[PDB]
Design a protein around this ligand. Structure first.
Ligand SMILES: *C(=O)[C@@H](NC(=O)Cc1ccccc1)[C@@H]1N[C@@H](C(=O)O)C(C)(C)S1
Length: 257
């Protein structure tokens, strides 16, 4: 409690923390219901919904696109404009590289932010507010609730898809594999977790120094932890520091042990 305030003190930032130990039902909450721009963590839920709406076979559908559908951070999708990419390959790119264009293509496919919100409401997430495609292209100003969620809701919806019954097991397995194989999170939740332990995570970064990671974390032996660490700062062009996330993860891990 004061460890998390210490981190807020040390990094001049606001933290939102929610963790669930699914083995004991122990919880670690710190501003659990405070809203942050969810930023690219929404990609994990976007794929959950894609997977609910498609057989694994249907993920082989090819999606074509041009250079004009690519804006900022498209490491995978910029390599394939000639051929396009299948839904499967877009999911991989979106989750493991946070390919922004891949995300936009998947979001279109599922019916846009309106359909994403519909499906999240259906799983009992009253908080996550998808509003815009690309939502990184627009600022979430303090007090704005469009494209925001909370640590607690993000954990709840992530557990629903990844760990519970919102997906049949072969699709839940695909989601988990992609997340475990994320390339973008080494300095975040993964840097705060004990060595060896498996981590499936999805990162995000926006304006106002927003720096997020959501994860499922497995102990050698036992049930997983599901965790959201959301952060933001006072100023629109504020810098973030990944260390804040890693260190907040350390505190959660302490508290769970
Ligand atoms: C979603 O979070 C994406 N963010 C952006 O495109 C905007 C942005 C804002 C500030 C700094 C950098 C980028 C992509 N996801 C993150 C992430 O997964 O950490 C990237 C920084 C890779 S871009």
């Amino acid at each position: 409690k004061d460890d998390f305030a210490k981190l807020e003190e040390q990094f001049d930032a606001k933290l939102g923390i929610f963790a669930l130990d699914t083995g004991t039902n122990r919880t670690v909450a710190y501003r659990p219901d405070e809203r942050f721009a969810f930023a690219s963590t929404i990609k994990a839920l976007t794929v959950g919904v894609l997977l609910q709406q498609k057989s694994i076979e249907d993920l082989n559908q090819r999606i074509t696109y041009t250079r004009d559908d690519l804006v900022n951070y498209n490491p995978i999708t910029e390599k394939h404009v000639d051929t396009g990419m299948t839904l499967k390959e877009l999911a991989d790119a979106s989750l493991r590289y946070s390919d922004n264009a891949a995300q936009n293509l998947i979001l279109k496919q599922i019916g846009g932010p309106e359909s994403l919100k519909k499906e999240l409401r259906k799983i009992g997430d009253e908080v996550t507010n998808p509003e815009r495609f690309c939502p990184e292209l627009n600022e979430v100003n303090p007090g704005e609730t469009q494209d925001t969620s909370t640590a607690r809701a993000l954990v709840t919806s992530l557990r629903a898809f990844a760990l519970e019954d919102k997906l049949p097991s072969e699709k839940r397995e695909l989601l988990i594999d992609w997340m475990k194989r994320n390339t973008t999170g080494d300095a975040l939740i993964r840097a705060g977790v004990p060595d060896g332990w498996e981590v499936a995570d999805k990162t995000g970064a926006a304006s106002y120094g927003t720096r997020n990671d959501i994860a499922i974390i497995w102990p050698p032996k036992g049930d997983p932890v599901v965790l959201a660490v959301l952060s933001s700062r006072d100023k629109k062009d504020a810098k973030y520091d990944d260390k804040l996330i890693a260190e907040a993860t350390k505190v959660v891990m302490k508290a769970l042990n």
